[PDB]
Amino acid sequence: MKKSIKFKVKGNCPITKDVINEYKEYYNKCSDWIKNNLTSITIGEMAKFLQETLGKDVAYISMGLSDEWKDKPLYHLFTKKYHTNNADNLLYYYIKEKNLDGYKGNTLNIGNTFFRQFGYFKLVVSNYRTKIRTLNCEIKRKKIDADSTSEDIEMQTMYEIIKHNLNKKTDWDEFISYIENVENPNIDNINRYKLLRKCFCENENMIKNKLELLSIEQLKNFGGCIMKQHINSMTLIIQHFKIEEKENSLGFILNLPLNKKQYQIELWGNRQVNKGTKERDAFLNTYGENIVFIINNDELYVVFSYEYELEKEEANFVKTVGLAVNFKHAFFVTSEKDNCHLDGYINLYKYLLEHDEFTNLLTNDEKKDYEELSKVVTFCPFENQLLFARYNKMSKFCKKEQVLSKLLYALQKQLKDENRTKEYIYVSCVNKLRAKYVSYFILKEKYYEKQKEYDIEMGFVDDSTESKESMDKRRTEFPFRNTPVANELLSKLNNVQQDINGCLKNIINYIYKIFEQNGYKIVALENLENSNFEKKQVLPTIKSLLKYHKLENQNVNDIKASDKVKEYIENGYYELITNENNEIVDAKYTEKGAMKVKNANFFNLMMKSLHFASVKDEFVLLSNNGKTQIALVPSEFTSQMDSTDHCLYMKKNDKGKLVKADKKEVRTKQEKHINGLNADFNAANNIKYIVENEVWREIFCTRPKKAEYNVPSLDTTKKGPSAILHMLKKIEAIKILET
RNA sequence: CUUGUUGUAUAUAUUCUUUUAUAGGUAUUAAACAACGGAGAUGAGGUG
Ligand SMILES: [Mg+2]
Ligand SMILES: [Mg+2]
């Protein structure tokens, strides 16, 4: 259906930076008003004032005084239930007849409806509507006890809904069922959910009104929708503009009518819209009405929107592959075995094993691990532990990161000289991804250090001498984000992340094209989500070590907080400085501990930065035009089931219910499953079987209706975790775990 | 108009940057292969 193209202007064009600046100022004032009145103002007062001023009884004005929306907050004009155009007209005429946007014409005297009613106000309404319909609040996990106020209980009651989607009584009951039926885990967490159920269904509607009220309050604090100073775009609706191909050129001409005057904007051609292609015909035959103007690095751009027909193919089920996405060791392990059958595939773990400068520093365990990986089809030999040796000068794993990097870069030069460009781009983007992640870490932790300096220089100290009422205001009135220094770091981070995204797309394109050019009609990923990531446990901070753990006053001989804290004291993580009482009053972060926290952060930050949960979206996008199709498998039990015999190990408690075992009851310390296989090779094989096997393909893979943009050919079922457990049990996917 | 954006050089000069240092900034210098539905500048941790 819809689709965009962007063009650049060549030379003469009346859309200067001042025009976009004026449009941006109008947008920002209007959206600032809407932000400041998202909830305080009532729709009823607006409609009554329109009754006072105009007096008409049109549909939108009548809907303002209807009993459904008479006293609801203004933000309901942006929800799903409220009629769209009625809200548009009501809000528009309210702002207009009060001159709250401050409109005083424009530079080029564009039509008032095309610049104000259908322009920046249209964008403001569209953007606020988009956000409020997908409100995403964020709350912390405060410890829940019997002694707590209703709000303290409720805040965590709303928290669990946010993190796990427990809107319904069914959603809670299917959740308690799951936890109690694996390993018989800690009773304390189950007690929490039981208490919340005693407090969730008690006040369901109140909780539902909350997490909307709170979500909006978390929207008027993050700035709402105020266009960021680096963007500088401008969207307009124009009625009779035409676009024609430039004469004797691979360009286009825009015939924009402005101020009743027929202008002419010269453009450059896009290779997207190159001559003779179907995309050029579709663009020129059916291009929309909305035009966007952007200033991107001191240059102007035009965005149009045309409509096309996608011809996405359908699932074939002849040659399938599962891709496990595990960031530890290789980024992309498949279900395939590296029998040198894939065309245009370079196995980098095999390349690292032929050389001896590498396998002379590797212990007997590491040799077996690397040689097990080298037998399978892997991709992007990211080594999170080795890569951290670049940042850690005193690392035990240094001289391994130097040899690894040198050998990889030497292979890159060899690939350049032998002219294998497909693999050359892959390896160069691998090297640059590894270096750019270190750059991202450097810049993002300079961001955090600078933020801490800013907090302790603006009086945002946790030790505060001001009212908490003022602190929240200033945290919003002058946050770190708006400061000039942060925009420098955020710009550098945007450049680095742009390189990261590009190199990641090059690697993903490489994998997809290898799978497509060999004949793999389906690629089965998993419905991975930010909950499927195992984050390394960061050490307790300075604040938490003394205050929560009550270490602020106790002797070294006195260890009552926890045993794990005592283990942290055993290693040189904290430097506990004794006071005159020989009990720890001042605490430190030791350089060993400082570099431990850095290792934890270095591993954890790979989730969002390297798109842990978006390595399926790019694969789907590559299938919108390719021949390989993408199948999403439920992100559970795939990395917990024996690949040789497809069964979930389960143990019989003496109570008498066959229940699954611990996630570590099946994994040893090494990345080897109890079936004697690499964990990722196990997980990848399981993924494929849930597609290869037709019965399992119908049980968990719910086929969408037809081919659609941005949609996999096969999707996971909507059944919850406990439903998936029982259905496998109902088909005898069961193995007794002989402990 | 060999035409737009992004990715991809471990390139020459560099009394530039440790806030991109196996990389960037400024001068250049060189190349094809790709993708492109506008895009993505929102939080770093502890006992669960
Ligand atoms: Mg770049
Ligand atoms: Mg280029």
Side-chain angles (χ1 to χ4, degrees), chain A residues 108-128:
Chain A
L108 299 193
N109 294 350
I110 311 173
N112 263 353
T113 76
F114 315 90
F115 191 87
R116 177 192 206 185
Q117 179 174 7
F118 291 67
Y120 59 84
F121 174 81
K122 189 180 184 183
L123 256 191
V124 163
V125 164
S126 305
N127 286 337
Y128 272 117

PDB file of all heavy atoms in Angstrom, chain A residues 108-128:
ATOM      1  N   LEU A 108       6.187  32.486   3.252  1.00  0.00           N
ATOM      2  CA  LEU A 108       5.821  32.346   1.852  1.00  0.00           C
ATOM      3  C   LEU A 108       4.326  32.489   1.613  1.00  0.00           C
ATOM      4  O   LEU A 108       3.869  32.273   0.487  1.00  0.00           O
ATOM      5  CB  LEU A 108       6.312  31.005   1.310  1.00  0.00           C
ATOM      6  CG  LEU A 108       7.823  30.788   1.351  1.00  0.00           C
ATOM      7  CD1 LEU A 108       8.208  29.587   0.515  1.00  0.00           C
ATOM      8  CD2 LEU A 108       8.553  32.026   0.872  1.00  0.00           C
ATOM      9  N   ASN A 109       3.559  32.847   2.640  1.00  0.00           N
ATOM     10  CA  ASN A 109       2.126  33.106   2.512  1.00  0.00           C
ATOM     11  C   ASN A 109       1.400  31.930   1.865  1.00  0.00           C
ATOM     12  O   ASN A 109       0.555  32.092   0.985  1.00  0.00           O
ATOM     13  CB  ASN A 109       1.874  34.401   1.743  1.00  0.00           C
ATOM     14  CG  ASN A 109       2.355  35.622   2.496  1.00  0.00           C
ATOM     15  OD1 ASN A 109       2.714  35.537   3.669  1.00  0.00           O
ATOM     16  ND2 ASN A 109       2.370  36.765   1.826  1.00  0.00           N
ATOM     17  N   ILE A 110       1.749  30.726   2.314  1.00  0.00           N
ATOM     18  CA  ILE A 110       1.044  29.525   1.890  1.00  0.00           C
ATOM     19  C   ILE A 110      -0.382  29.558   2.435  1.00  0.00           C
ATOM     20  O   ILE A 110      -0.677  30.226   3.429  1.00  0.00           O
ATOM     21  CB  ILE A 110       1.801  28.266   2.351  1.00  0.00           C
ATOM     22  CG1 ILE A 110       3.277  28.382   1.978  1.00  0.00           C
ATOM     23  CG2 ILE A 110       1.223  27.013   1.729  1.00  0.00           C
ATOM     24  CD1 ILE A 110       4.139  27.276   2.528  1.00  0.00           C
ATOM     25  N   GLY A 111      -1.281  28.846   1.754  1.00  0.00           N
ATOM     26  CA  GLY A 111      -2.678  28.808   2.143  1.00  0.00           C
ATOM     27  C   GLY A 111      -2.874  28.468   3.604  1.00  0.00           C
ATOM     28  O   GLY A 111      -2.220  27.561   4.124  1.00  0.00           O
ATOM     29  N   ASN A 112      -3.766  29.199   4.280  1.00  0.00           N
ATOM     30  CA  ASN A 112      -3.911  29.050   5.724  1.00  0.00           C
ATOM     31  C   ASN A 112      -4.347  27.644   6.105  1.00  0.00           C
ATOM     32  O   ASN A 112      -3.865  27.089   7.095  1.00  0.00           O
ATOM     33  CB  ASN A 112      -4.902  30.076   6.266  1.00  0.00           C
ATOM     34  CG  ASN A 112      -4.219  31.300   6.828  1.00  0.00           C
ATOM     35  OD1 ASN A 112      -2.993  31.349   6.930  1.00  0.00           O
ATOM     36  ND2 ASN A 112      -5.008  32.298   7.199  1.00  0.00           N
ATOM     37  N   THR A 113      -5.268  27.055   5.346  1.00  0.00           N
ATOM     38  CA  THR A 113      -5.675  25.685   5.641  1.00  0.00           C
ATOM     39  C   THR A 113      -4.543  24.702   5.367  1.00  0.00           C
ATOM     40  O   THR A 113      -4.400  23.702   6.075  1.00  0.00           O
ATOM     41  CB  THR A 113      -6.916  25.315   4.833  1.00  0.00           C
ATOM     42  OG1 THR A 113      -6.550  25.068   3.469  1.00  0.00           O
ATOM     43  CG2 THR A 113      -7.927  26.445   4.884  1.00  0.00           C
ATOM     44  N   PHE A 114      -3.729  24.968   4.348  1.00  0.00           N
ATOM     45  CA  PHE A 114      -2.626  24.079   4.009  1.00  0.00           C
ATOM     46  C   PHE A 114      -1.411  24.260   4.909  1.00  0.00           C
ATOM     47  O   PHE A 114      -0.517  23.410   4.888  1.00  0.00           O
ATOM     48  CB  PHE A 114      -2.208  24.289   2.552  1.00  0.00           C
ATOM     49  CG  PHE A 114      -3.361  24.364   1.592  1.00  0.00           C
ATOM     50  CD1 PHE A 114      -3.956  25.575   1.297  1.00  0.00           C
ATOM     51  CD2 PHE A 114      -3.847  23.220   0.985  1.00  0.00           C
ATOM     52  CE1 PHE A 114      -5.011  25.643   0.417  1.00  0.00           C
ATOM     53  CE2 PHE A 114      -4.901  23.281   0.106  1.00  0.00           C
ATOM     54  CZ  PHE A 114      -5.485  24.494  -0.179  1.00  0.00           C
ATOM     55  N   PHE A 115      -1.349  25.337   5.694  1.00  0.00           N
ATOM     56  CA  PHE A 115      -0.207  25.591   6.559  1.00  0.00           C
ATOM     57  C   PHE A 115      -0.522  25.457   8.040  1.00  0.00           C
ATOM     58  O   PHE A 115       0.380  25.131   8.817  1.00  0.00           O
ATOM     59  CB  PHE A 115       0.357  26.997   6.292  1.00  0.00           C
ATOM     60  CG  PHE A 115       1.686  27.259   6.947  1.00  0.00           C
ATOM     61  CD1 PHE A 115       2.865  26.914   6.313  1.00  0.00           C
ATOM     62  CD2 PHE A 115       1.756  27.850   8.195  1.00  0.00           C
ATOM     63  CE1 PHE A 115       4.083  27.153   6.913  1.00  0.00           C
ATOM     64  CE2 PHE A 115       2.973  28.090   8.797  1.00  0.00           C
ATOM     65  CZ  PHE A 115       4.136  27.742   8.156  1.00  0.00           C
ATOM     66  N   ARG A 116      -1.766  25.689   8.451  1.00  0.00           N
ATOM     67  CA  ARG A 116      -2.124  25.702   9.863  1.00  0.00           C
ATOM     68  C   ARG A 116      -3.112  24.600  10.220  1.00  0.00           C
ATOM     69  O   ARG A 116      -2.826  23.798  11.111  1.00  0.00           O
ATOM     70  CB  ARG A 116      -2.685  27.081  10.224  1.00  0.00           C
ATOM     71  CG  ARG A 116      -3.158  27.203  11.643  1.00  0.00           C
ATOM     72  CD  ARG A 116      -3.944  28.473  11.841  1.00  0.00           C
ATOM     73  NE  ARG A 116      -3.889  28.921  13.225  1.00  0.00           N
ATOM     74  CZ  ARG A 116      -4.559  29.961  13.701  1.00  0.00           C
ATOM     75  NH1 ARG A 116      -5.373  30.669  12.937  1.00  0.00           N
ATOM     76  NH2 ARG A 116      -4.404  30.299  14.977  1.00  0.00           N
ATOM     77  N   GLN A 117      -4.266  24.530   9.555  1.00  0.00           N
ATOM     78  CA  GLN A 117      -5.259  23.519   9.907  1.00  0.00           C
ATOM     79  C   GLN A 117      -4.827  22.132   9.452  1.00  0.00           C
ATOM     80  O   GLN A 117      -4.950  21.157  10.199  1.00  0.00           O
ATOM     81  CB  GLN A 117      -6.617  23.878   9.308  1.00  0.00           C
ATOM     82  CG  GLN A 117      -7.696  22.858   9.620  1.00  0.00           C
ATOM     83  CD  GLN A 117      -9.068  23.291   9.158  1.00  0.00           C
ATOM     84  OE1 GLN A 117      -9.217  24.309   8.489  1.00  0.00           O
ATOM     85  NE2 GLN A 117     -10.081  22.517   9.519  1.00  0.00           N
ATOM     86  N   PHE A 118      -4.328  22.020   8.224  1.00  0.00           N
ATOM     87  CA  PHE A 118      -3.847  20.755   7.691  1.00  0.00           C
ATOM     88  C   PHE A 118      -2.333  20.636   7.748  1.00  0.00           C
ATOM     89  O   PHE A 118      -1.766  19.744   7.111  1.00  0.00           O
ATOM     90  CB  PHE A 118      -4.319  20.566   6.250  1.00  0.00           C
ATOM     91  CG  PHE A 118      -5.799  20.352   6.110  1.00  0.00           C
ATOM     92  CD1 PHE A 118      -6.695  21.363   6.400  1.00  0.00           C
ATOM     93  CD2 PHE A 118      -6.291  19.136   5.670  1.00  0.00           C
ATOM     94  CE1 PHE A 118      -8.048  21.166   6.264  1.00  0.00           C
ATOM     95  CE2 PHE A 118      -7.645  18.936   5.534  1.00  0.00           C
ATOM     96  CZ  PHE A 118      -8.523  19.954   5.832  1.00  0.00           C
ATOM     97  N   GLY A 119      -1.663  21.516   8.483  1.00  0.00           N
ATOM     98  CA  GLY A 119      -0.219  21.463   8.557  1.00  0.00           C
ATOM     99  C   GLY A 119       0.316  21.051   9.910  1.00  0.00           C
ATOM    100  O   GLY A 119       0.232  19.879  10.304  1.00  0.00           O
ATOM    101  N   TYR A 120       0.876  22.018  10.636  1.00  0.00           N
ATOM    102  CA  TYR A 120       1.529  21.689  11.896  1.00  0.00           C
ATOM    103  C   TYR A 120       0.518  21.241  12.938  1.00  0.00           C
ATOM    104  O   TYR A 120       0.832  20.405  13.789  1.00  0.00           O
ATOM    105  CB  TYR A 120       2.344  22.875  12.406  1.00  0.00           C
ATOM    106  CG  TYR A 120       1.562  24.133  12.649  1.00  0.00           C
ATOM    107  CD1 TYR A 120       0.881  24.326  13.839  1.00  0.00           C
ATOM    108  CD2 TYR A 120       1.532  25.141  11.707  1.00  0.00           C
ATOM    109  CE1 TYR A 120       0.171  25.474  14.074  1.00  0.00           C
ATOM    110  CE2 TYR A 120       0.825  26.298  11.936  1.00  0.00           C
ATOM    111  CZ  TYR A 120       0.149  26.457  13.124  1.00  0.00           C
ATOM    112  OH  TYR A 120      -0.559  27.605  13.367  1.00  0.00           O
ATOM    113  N   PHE A 121      -0.699  21.784  12.895  1.00  0.00           N
ATOM    114  CA  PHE A 121      -1.718  21.322  13.832  1.00  0.00           C
ATOM    115  C   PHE A 121      -2.118  19.887  13.527  1.00  0.00           C
ATOM    116  O   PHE A 121      -2.348  19.088  14.443  1.00  0.00           O
ATOM    117  CB  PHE A 121      -2.943  22.227  13.802  1.00  0.00           C
ATOM    118  CG  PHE A 121      -4.074  21.711  14.629  1.00  0.00           C
ATOM    119  CD1 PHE A 121      -4.085  21.911  15.995  1.00  0.00           C
ATOM    120  CD2 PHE A 121      -5.098  20.985  14.055  1.00  0.00           C
ATOM    121  CE1 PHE A 121      -5.103  21.421  16.767  1.00  0.00           C
ATOM    122  CE2 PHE A 121      -6.117  20.489  14.826  1.00  0.00           C
ATOM    123  CZ  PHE A 121      -6.120  20.707  16.184  1.00  0.00           C
ATOM    124  N   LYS A 122      -2.213  19.543  12.244  1.00  0.00           N
ATOM    125  CA  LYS A 122      -2.478  18.159  11.878  1.00  0.00           C
ATOM    126  C   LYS A 122      -1.390  17.242  12.416  1.00  0.00           C
ATOM    127  O   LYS A 122      -1.680  16.178  12.973  1.00  0.00           O
ATOM    128  CB  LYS A 122      -2.593  18.022  10.362  1.00  0.00           C
ATOM    129  CG  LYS A 122      -3.069  16.656   9.912  1.00  0.00           C
ATOM    130  CD  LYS A 122      -3.165  16.562   8.401  1.00  0.00           C
ATOM    131  CE  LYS A 122      -3.724  15.217   7.972  1.00  0.00           C
ATOM    132  NZ  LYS A 122      -3.751  15.074   6.495  1.00  0.00           N
ATOM    133  N   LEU A 123      -0.126  17.648  12.272  1.00  0.00           N
ATOM    134  CA  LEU A 123       0.965  16.832  12.801  1.00  0.00           C
ATOM    135  C   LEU A 123       0.906  16.725  14.319  1.00  0.00           C
ATOM    136  O   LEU A 123       1.168  15.662  14.882  1.00  0.00           O
ATOM    137  CB  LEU A 123       2.317  17.388  12.372  1.00  0.00           C
ATOM    138  CG  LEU A 123       3.016  16.632  11.250  1.00  0.00           C
ATOM    139  CD1 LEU A 123       4.434  17.131  11.136  1.00  0.00           C
ATOM    140  CD2 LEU A 123       2.994  15.151  11.539  1.00  0.00           C
ATOM    141  N   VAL A 124       0.599  17.825  15.003  1.00  0.00           N
ATOM    142  CA  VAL A 124       0.557  17.795  16.462  1.00  0.00           C
ATOM    143  C   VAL A 124      -0.523  16.835  16.941  1.00  0.00           C
ATOM    144  O   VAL A 124      -0.299  16.008  17.833  1.00  0.00           O
ATOM    145  CB  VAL A 124       0.338  19.210  17.023  1.00  0.00           C
ATOM    146  CG1 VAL A 124      -0.101  19.126  18.446  1.00  0.00           C
ATOM    147  CG2 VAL A 124       1.609  20.014  16.937  1.00  0.00           C
ATOM    148  N   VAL A 125      -1.712  16.930  16.345  1.00  0.00           N
ATOM    149  CA  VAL A 125      -2.804  16.033  16.705  1.00  0.00           C
ATOM    150  C   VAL A 125      -2.445  14.588  16.386  1.00  0.00           C
ATOM    151  O   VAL A 125      -2.704  13.679  17.183  1.00  0.00           O
ATOM    152  CB  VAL A 125      -4.098  16.471  16.000  1.00  0.00           C
ATOM    153  CG1 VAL A 125      -5.127  15.361  16.031  1.00  0.00           C
ATOM    154  CG2 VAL A 125      -4.647  17.699  16.678  1.00  0.00           C
ATOM    155  N   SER A 126      -1.834  14.351  15.224  1.00  0.00           N
ATOM    156  CA  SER A 126      -1.464  12.994  14.840  1.00  0.00           C
ATOM    157  C   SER A 126      -0.444  12.408  15.805  1.00  0.00           C
ATOM    158  O   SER A 126      -0.511  11.225  16.154  1.00  0.00           O
ATOM    159  CB  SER A 126      -0.914  12.992  13.417  1.00  0.00           C
ATOM    160  OG  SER A 126      -1.838  13.569  12.514  1.00  0.00           O
ATOM    161  N   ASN A 127       0.523  13.219  16.233  1.00  0.00           N
ATOM    162  CA  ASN A 127       1.599  12.717  17.077  1.00  0.00           C
ATOM    163  C   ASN A 127       1.117  12.471  18.500  1.00  0.00           C
ATOM    164  O   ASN A 127       1.466  11.461  19.118  1.00  0.00           O
ATOM    165  CB  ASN A 127       2.771  13.698  17.059  1.00  0.00           C
ATOM    166  CG  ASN A 127       3.548  13.647  15.765  1.00  0.00           C
ATOM    167  OD1 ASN A 127       3.522  12.647  15.051  1.00  0.00           O
ATOM    168  ND2 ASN A 127       4.250  14.725  15.457  1.00  0.00           N
ATOM    169  N   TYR A 128       0.325  13.394  19.047  1.00  0.00           N
ATOM    170  CA  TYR A 128      -0.236  13.168  20.374  1.00  0.00           C
ATOM    171  C   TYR A 128      -1.173  11.971  20.372  1.00  0.00           C
ATOM    172  O   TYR A 128      -1.170  11.167  21.310  1.00  0.00           O
ATOM    173  CB  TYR A 128      -0.967  14.415  20.859  1.00  0.00           C
ATOM    174  CG  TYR A 128      -0.075  15.387  21.572  1.00  0.00           C
ATOM    175  CD1 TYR A 128       0.140  16.656  21.065  1.00  0.00           C
ATOM    176  CD2 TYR A 128       0.554  15.040  22.752  1.00  0.00           C
ATOM    177  CE1 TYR A 128       0.958  17.550  21.713  1.00  0.00           C
ATOM    178  CE2 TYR A 128       1.375  15.927  23.404  1.00  0.00           C
ATOM    179  CZ  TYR A 128       1.571  17.181  22.882  1.00  0.00           C
ATOM    180  OH  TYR A 128       2.385  18.074  23.527  1.00  0.00           O
TER     181      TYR A 128
END
